[PDB]
Amino acid sequence: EVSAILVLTSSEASTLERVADLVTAHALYAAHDFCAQAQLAAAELPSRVVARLQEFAWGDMNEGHLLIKGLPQVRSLPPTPTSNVHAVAATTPMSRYQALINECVGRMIAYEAEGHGHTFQDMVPSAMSAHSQTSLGSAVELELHTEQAFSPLRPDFVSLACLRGDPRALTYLFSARQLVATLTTQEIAMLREPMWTTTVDESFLAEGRTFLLGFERGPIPILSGADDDPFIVFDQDLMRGISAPAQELQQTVIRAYYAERVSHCLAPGEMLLIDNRRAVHGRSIFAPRFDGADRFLSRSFIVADGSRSRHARSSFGRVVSARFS
Numbered sequence: 001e002v003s004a005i006l007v008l009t010s011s012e013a014s015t016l017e018r019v020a021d022l023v024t025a026h027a028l029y030a031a032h033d034f035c036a037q038a039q040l041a042a043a044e045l046p047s048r049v050v051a052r053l054q055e056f057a058w059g060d061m062n063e064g065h066l067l068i069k070g071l072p073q074v075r076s077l078p079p080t081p082t083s084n085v086h087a088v089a090a091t092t093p094m095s096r097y098q099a100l101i102n103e104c105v106g107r108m109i110a111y112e113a114e115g116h117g118h119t120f121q122d123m124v125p126s127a128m129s130a131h132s133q134t135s136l137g138s139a140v141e142l143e144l145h146t147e148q149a150f151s152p153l154r155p156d157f158v159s160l161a162c163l164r165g166d167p168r169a170l171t172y173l174f175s176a177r178q179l180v181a182t183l184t185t186q187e188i189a190m191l192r193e194p195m196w197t198t199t200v201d202e203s204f205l206a207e208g209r210t211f212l213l214g215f216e217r218g219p220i221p222i223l224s225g226a227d228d229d230p231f232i233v234f235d236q237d238l239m240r241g242i243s244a245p246a247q248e249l250q251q252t253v254i255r256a257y258y259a260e261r262v263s264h265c266l267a268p269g270e271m272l273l274i275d276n277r278r279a280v281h282g283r284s285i286f287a288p289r290f291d292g293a294d295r296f297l298s299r300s301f302i303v304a305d306g307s308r309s310r311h312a313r314s315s316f317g318r319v320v321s322a323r324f325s
């Protein structure tokens, strides 16, 4: 299991519910005002909660993730949308609770090329099966990855709030610290070498869309940073080793992930913060019904520094333009 857990008491959950009334702007149509109101209102959250979130945000020895339990109950939840294009989560009370927690940690951001720049994306099963694929997506394991491995503007954190869970849908987490503990000195040194080229994810592609950084990037290393607190960039579908040993080292990371990954089945009222520099994530197979009661998460992204993406956004805008990813 996860172990890095923050459990809100009923009094803390009640304070959070009250503080959410200070966030009144439309999350989709006035994203910057919505996020700025959440950042200001987050000062009213219980100090014990704020302390834990700031410690996690600092990063040093943070475990790669933070699971938050005991959020106020999801009460009049609409049916789970059958597609992930509606942005239903963005108008629920859970999205306000998620914004308050997010804005303690850092600045919320969105990407034009990822779910049409929605402040909160609906993470719901897709019935879609493209040419290469032999299954709709939930029918296969979502492989270990860091979010936007190809992009220097990738989020620092991935935020997932659970509206409806599925008991067979396990979220898998595996930290860069867990990886390094299983490797030899030589494997660690090689993972720190720029031996992997990156490719823009197919979902980021569009007619007439050109990326300033091109379609193929790198070579880049898989590991970087401090020896005792390494950062990881990984994605087997979008990363190709420049040589046979670099390709074999990707397999070594995958085997270590299967051996050491921790799992958690997200349930209503829970929120998971993933440190996108310190951990990789994945998801098991599950069997959605597309009946209105399927697994439904609200996903959002966090960056420590909004100035790093200013060149890619408009003034008082929260959306990174596609060509800059």
Ligand SMILES: O=C(O)CCC(=O)C(=O)O
Pocket (backbone or CB within 6 Å): 123, 142, 147, 158, 160, 170, 171, 172, 281, 282, 283, 299
């Ligand atoms: O469905 C999950 O548990 C995680 C999905 C995922 O890859 C994400 O949140 O980026």
Ligand SMILES: [Fe+2]
Pocket (backbone or CB within 6 Å): 145, 146, 147, 281
């Ligand atoms: Fe992901």
